[PDB]
Every structure is written in structure tokens, then in C-alpha cells.
Design a protein around this ligand. Structure first.
Ligand code: GLC
Ligand code: GLC
Ligand code: GLC
Ligand code: CL
Ligand code: NA
Lengths: 504, 11
């Protein structure tokens, strides 16, 4: 039966070929005759050739339908692959007949899912460009299959990601997220955007297409798989969304999600908020206005020693406690929502270096508010900051530990101490811990930012006569005179102030 | 019909 029809498929008369195509299709519908077609590598080559070369609507439907039935089995998937069926199927994607299109996209889906070598074959056949072009179709079930194909092709393949970008992929995918409500489609499209959102080229494009706001629409959808993929993609994109506006709604939802029972939801919300509030005074304002400080302190308390939650949450708190209209109110709110004890706790083991760095920065900002000077002292912040500083300095003098340079710890701790030293009782504590020798040694640091905070803390201390004499006794006049000529105006200003107080 | 059938099979 099989070689008879293979001879009729290779006929010079196309009429004979058309009649043979309808017969081969009906045979693919039964299991006995289907395995017969799959066992013959000469029959499968004829079906592929018939499909690619036919100009007849029915023959294209029957040859594509036949190949679809083979794709249900491992033997048939291997047959279509070895018979060069992938480029033939790709050609069928330009078909104005829906039934031909639906056979091709589903067969290609099956090949991409279970057949080795198929992802490379589809790329080489120009499949990516054809698939991106079809994203203007309005059938949500077809769109769901097409987008899933793009996900398979883009995953772990920076080449494919770049092609999707060039073909207007980001804009088309964002449109789907703004236009449809069909969950299965929203979810598959969000998975494509997730894959693309780790690409340094695709990321600014997705953000420019309005991807942050589009993904924000679906954060309260009942579907948890859709919410989570939106959250992952949002986190990936969030470091490139600094200039975006129309973010009020997203920012409000993210604060709400901080109270979620899902730790993955909490982690992502904290991380997105952290990125979006980094040096964006308008976003800082919005997050504070919708109860962001309270939400973040509660998050830090509940998270305990889970640093995947506390690190982004503490970073967000650091951003929200400086350089915006409501910064003062936020500094106070951290105290009023019982946050100061837990913030000091995070300076201690088992906290790793990324979290310690963030916590020190937050304490530095908290100390800008005088009402936090005494509670920070009472909660034990000064001795721990000094211990951190002393050891960090030693580590630099001997020589990235957990991605963090110990210079960053020196600068951070000295900076926090510089701000805490505005209070008279804090200066007593700082001086009593024998810090002046270390602060004077820091004047000789190659790093200008360290010289600035070291000079600043010495400047605060020297306002008390006893401390000024100790600073002088440490031979500080020599480094300080040299620092008067620093290209850093902050260093030079502070050095002059210390020298002044040492001369009376 | 092919679409419904395929959706069910895959997901
Ligand atoms: O994470 C999703 C990915 O999982 C696996 O790597 C599959 O091979 C790939 O097709 C899929 O896109
Ligand atoms: O779901 C797999 C991964 O998706 C995204 O790339 C997220 O950024 C990452 O945190 C997650 O683990
Ligand atoms: O609190 C307002 C300002 O106080 C101090 O001048 C700090 O040096 C500065 O960083 C802060 O922005
Ligand atoms: Cl301590
Ligand atoms: Na700052």
C-alpha cells in the first residue's frame, strides 16, 4: 500500500498527486496504517515534498495534516526531522488558509517540544521571523501556541532573542498583554517576555514598549502562574525602568503584594520596589504615600534571617529614607513602626555581606533624623558599626568577599558614624571605643570617599576640646594639611574644619 | 478543533 502511493506522490501529473494525498491522510488516522507510513523514509520524504511544492489548498491541508498525525509519536517526529519537514512546515506558516496554518504551528510545536535538533532547524528555516509576524493574528488559541514556540526557541539562545528583537517582538508581546484576557495566552506571552528580559538588548526595548505597566495589569489575576511570571519579568526589567512614568498603579500593587503569604511574591515585590526607588524621587514619594515604610518594616520583621527577602527590603528602605520630599517622615516612620531594633540586629551574624552593606546604608539615613539618634544608640548600633569597620579595615590592609569589597564596608560604617556623631552622647560612645587612631589612619586611604567620611567624623568629634587634642596627638595635622589640596571639595572643606578646631 | 485538542494534549 505504502510504495504504491509513494509512486503516485512523485507523479508528473499533479492531479494524480492530489488524489494520492487525500488517501495518505485517511491512512494517518488509523494506528496500523500510520506506523506503515512512519516506517518508510521514502514515503515521508514524498509527503514533505508534496506539501512544500503544492499549489492546491486541499493537498496542503492533507500533507500538513498527515505530518501532524506523525508528530504524536517519537518515530514520526524523527521522520519529519530527517525528511527535511521543518523548513517545509515553516513555509506553511505564510498560508492564507487557517487549517494549513494550524497544522503547521501545532506540528512545529510538537517538534520543538520533543524532537532533538528541531530548535536549530526552525531558526535556520527563518521560523522566528514568520512566528513574530503572526502575532498580529487575533485567535487567542493560535496566539498561545505561537508564543509558546517563541519561548522554546528563545530559551537559552541569545541569537534567537536578538532576532525576536529585530522583528518587533517586544512591542507585539506587550500588545498581547494589554489586549487579551485569555489566561493561557497571557501566561505563555509572559514566559516569552521573561526569557527576553534577561537580554541586555531586549530589556530597554520591552521597557520602551510599555512592558512594566502592561505586566502590572495582571498582578491581581487569580492565576498564580501568571502573577509570578509577571513578577519575575518585572524584577528583571526594573533596573532599566528609572525614567518610566504612569507607575503609580504598579507601585501601589507592589506594596500590597508585600503582605502576601507567598515568599516568592514577597521577594519579587521587594526587589522591584528596591530597583524602582533607586534614585527616583517621584517613585520614592509614591511608595511612601501608599504606606510603603510600614509595609517594608513588617516584611523585614516577618522574613527573619531569609536574606533573599531582607536584602531588597532593606535596600528599598534605604532609598525611601533619603533625597525626596517625604524623606524625614519616612526616617521617623521606620522608628514608629518598631523597625530600629531589627535593623541593628541585621548587622550581626548570620547576615552575609550584601545585607550588612545595605543595613549600614539604611542606618546612615536613619541617623539623619535626630529622634533616631538615641534609639539607635540604645539598641547597640555604635559598637557593632565600629567592630565592622575595624575588621574591614584590617582586611584591606592585609590584601571581593561575597561580591562585596571590604573598602565598601569601611566607607559605609565610617559614613554612618559621621552622621551619628551629630549627637553629643554618641560622640562620647564613639570616642570611648578608641576610634580616633583608626579615623586618622583612614585619611591616608587612596579612596576619596573614605577620606571624606573619615574627615567628616573627625570634624564632628573635634567640636569637643578633649577629642580635638586626641586627634592632634594622633598626628592628624600632617595628612589633613595635604588633604586641603584634594580635588574632592568635600575632603578639603572637612580637613580645614578639623585643622581649625585643633588650633582652638 | 485542532487547537482545542492540541491545547489539552500539551497543557
Ligand atoms: O524554562 C523553560 C524551558 O525549560 C527547558 O529548558 C525546555 O527545554 C525549554 O523548552 C523551556 O523553554
Ligand atoms: O523561574 C526561573 C527564573 O525566572 C527569572 O529569570 C527570575 O528572575 C528568576 O529569579 C527565576 O528563578
Ligand atoms: O537631611 C537632609 C540632608 O542632611 C545633611 O546635610 C546630609 O549630609 C544630607 O545627605 C541630607 O540630604
Ligand atoms: Cl555589638
Ligand atoms: Na544617599
Amino acid at each position: 500500500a505504502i510504495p504504491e502511493l509513494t509512486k503516485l506522490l512523485n507523479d508528473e501529473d499533479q492531479v494524480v498527486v492530489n488524489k494520492a494525498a487525500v488517501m495518505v491522510h485517511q491512512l494517518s488516522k488509523k494506528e496500523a496504517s500510520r506506523h506503515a507510513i512512519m516506517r518508510s523514509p521514502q514515503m515521508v520524504s514524498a509527503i514533505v515534498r508534496t506539501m512544500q511544492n503544492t499549489n492546491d489548498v486541499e493537498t496542503a491541508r492533507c500533507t500538513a495534516g498527515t505530518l501532524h498525525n506523525l508528530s504524536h509519536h517519537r518515530e514520526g517526529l524523527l521522520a519529519i526531522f530527517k525528511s527535511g519537514g521543518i523548513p517545509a512546515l515553516v513555509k506553511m506558516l505564510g498560508s492564507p488558509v487557517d487549517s494549513v496554518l494550524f497544522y503547521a504551528i501545532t506540528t512545529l510545536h510538537n517538534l520543538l517540544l520533543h524532537q532533538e535538533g528541531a530548535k536549530m532547524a526552525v531558526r535556520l528555516a527563518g521560523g522566528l521571523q514568520k512566528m513574530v509576524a503572526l502575532l498580529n493574528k487575533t485567535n487567542v488559541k493560535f496566539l498561545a501556541i505561537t508564543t509558546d514556540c517563541l519561548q522554546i526557541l528563545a530559551y537559552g539562545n541569545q541569537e534567537s532573542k536578538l532576532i525576536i528583537l529585530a522583528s518587533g517582538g517586544p512591542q507585539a508581546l506587550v500588545n498581547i498583554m494589554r489586549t487579551y484576557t485569555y489566561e493561557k495566552l497571557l501566561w505563555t506571552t509572559s514566559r516569552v517576555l521573561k526569557v527576553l528580559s534577561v537580554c541586555s538588548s531586549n530589556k530597554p526595548a520591552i521597557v520602551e514598549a510599555g512592558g512594566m505597566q502592561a505586566l502590572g495589569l495582571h498582578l491581581t489575576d487569580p492565576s498564580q502562574r501568571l502573577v509570578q511570571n509577571c513578577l519575575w519579568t518585572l524584577r528583571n526589567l526594573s533596573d532599566a525602568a528609572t525614567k518610566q512614568e504612569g507607575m503609580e498603579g504598579l507601585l501601589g500593587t507592589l506594596v500590597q503584594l508585600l503582605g502576601s503569604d507567598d515568599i516568592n511574591v514577597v521577594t519579587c515585590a521587594a526587589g522591584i520596589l528596591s530597583n524602582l526607588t533607586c534614585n527616583n524621587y517621584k517613585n520614592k514619594m509614591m511608595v511612601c504615600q501608599v504606606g510603603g515604610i510600614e509595609a517594608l518594616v513588617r516584611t523585614v520583621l516577618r522574613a527573619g534571617d531569609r536574606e533573599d527577602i531582607t536584602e531588597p527590603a532593606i535596600c528599598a528602605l534605604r532609598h525611601l529614607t533619603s533625597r525626596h520630599q517625604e524623606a524625614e517622615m519616612a526616617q521617623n516612620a521606620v522608628r514608629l513602626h518598631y523597625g530600629l531594633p531589627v535593623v541593628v540586629k541585621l548587622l550581626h551574624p548570620p547576615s552575609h555581606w550584601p545585607l550588612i552593606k545595605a543595613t549600614v546604608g539604611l542606618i546612615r539615613n536613619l541617623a539623619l533624623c535626630p529622634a533616631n539618634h538615641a534609639p539607635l544608640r540604645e539598641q547597640g548600633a555604635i559598637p557593632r558599626l565600629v567592630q565592622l569597620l575595624v575588621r574591614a579595615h584590617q582586611d584591606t590592609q592585609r590584601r571581593f568577599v561575597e561580591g562585596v569589597r571590604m573598602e565598601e564596608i569601611v566607607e559605609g560604617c565610617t559614613g554612618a558614624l559621621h552622621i551619628l556623631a551629630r549627637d553629643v552622647h554618641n560622640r562620647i560612645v564613639i570616642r570611648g571605643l578608641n576610634t580616633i587612631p583608626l579615623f586618622v589612619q583612614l585619611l591616608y586611604s587612596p579612596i576619596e570617599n573614605i577620606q571624606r567620611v573619615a574627615a567628616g567624623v573627625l570634624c564632628e568629634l573635634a567640636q569637643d576640646k578633649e577629642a580635638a587634642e586626641a586627634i592632634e596627638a594622633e598626628g592628624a595635622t600632617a595628612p589633613l594639611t595635604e588633604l586641603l589640596h584634594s580635588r574632592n571639595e568635600g575632603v578639603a572643606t572637612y580637613a580645614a574644619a578639623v585643622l581649625f578646631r585643633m588650633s582652638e | 478543533x485542532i487547537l482545542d485538542x492540541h491545547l489539552x494534549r500539551v497543557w
